[PDB]
Symmetry: C2
Subunit: 148 residues, 2 copies
């Protein structure tokens, strides 16, 4: 492999069984991306096509409110995933910005590629069931604090 693909494969192997062949296959779909702090990866209104795995660093999801003030809705640190998921799944313009908080190392995959990957390596359904279950659990908690 390389360090970034290794990070992703290791994380996946925490949760599911993955052969070496599967690891190569899966890796081909994911692109290495290095960004400096405060680099914008997605803007409100742009078609959202990309899901990010955070190898190193910190991403934030935010929008601009009626006063022109940035409101950050969440972060994603190492081993977490981020996109504007409604826009990603519907293949439509984003509600949110995505921007790096620190220098980051990311792996990126497109919607179409991720859909193919689910078909090719169906074990990944369990990995992403776990990722999304945990992400949603975290979002529920954030709402409690956002309502406080």
């Amino acid at each position: 492999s390389n360090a970034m693909h290794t990070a992703l494969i290791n994380h996946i192997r925490k949760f599911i069984f993955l052969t070496d062949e599967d690891a190569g296959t899966l890796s081909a779909f994911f692109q290495l991306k290095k960004v400096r702090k405060k680099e914008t990866l997605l803007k409100t209104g742009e078609i959202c096509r990309i899901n990010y795995f955070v190898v190193k660093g910190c991403l934030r999801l935010f929008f601009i409110d009626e006063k022109g003030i940035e409101q950050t809705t969440q972060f994603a640190i190492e081993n977490w995933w981020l996109s504007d998921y409604m826009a990603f799944q519907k293949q439509q313009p984003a509600d949110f910005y995505i921007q790096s908080v620190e220098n980051c190392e990311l792996l990126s995959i497109t919607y179409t590629e991720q859909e193919n990957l689910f078909e090719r390596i169906p074990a990944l359904e369990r990995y992403f069931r776990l990722v999304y279950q945990k992400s949603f659990a975290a979002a529920q908690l954030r709402s409690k604090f956002q309502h406080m």
Copy 2:
């Protein structure tokens, strides 16, 4: 056979009639009148609910004693306090029926057994949680603004 639950699942995955029968046996039917509390803050959260009919709400009580509702689940959708559910620990949230409900419930232990017995369901819940997460992101924005 829990017809409503099977129909919903079949919108996302293929499921044999046999596996549908096997899956159904992990779920208990629960009928509850409106305004019945199913979970309280501080109670150990064990149960994930599928709403066959009705509406559940998730809320917490702030330090002024005001109930702050954070989520609803209507027919054909799911609700629990997911952090408490997955960690098998005391709840942050209350769950209460808003209308008279017909529910199907499963415990965390049972649901993990079910994923092992019927692995095709991993895809169903991947999609359920993906959509739930997307909706939660959007709620965060819409609550701030509108």
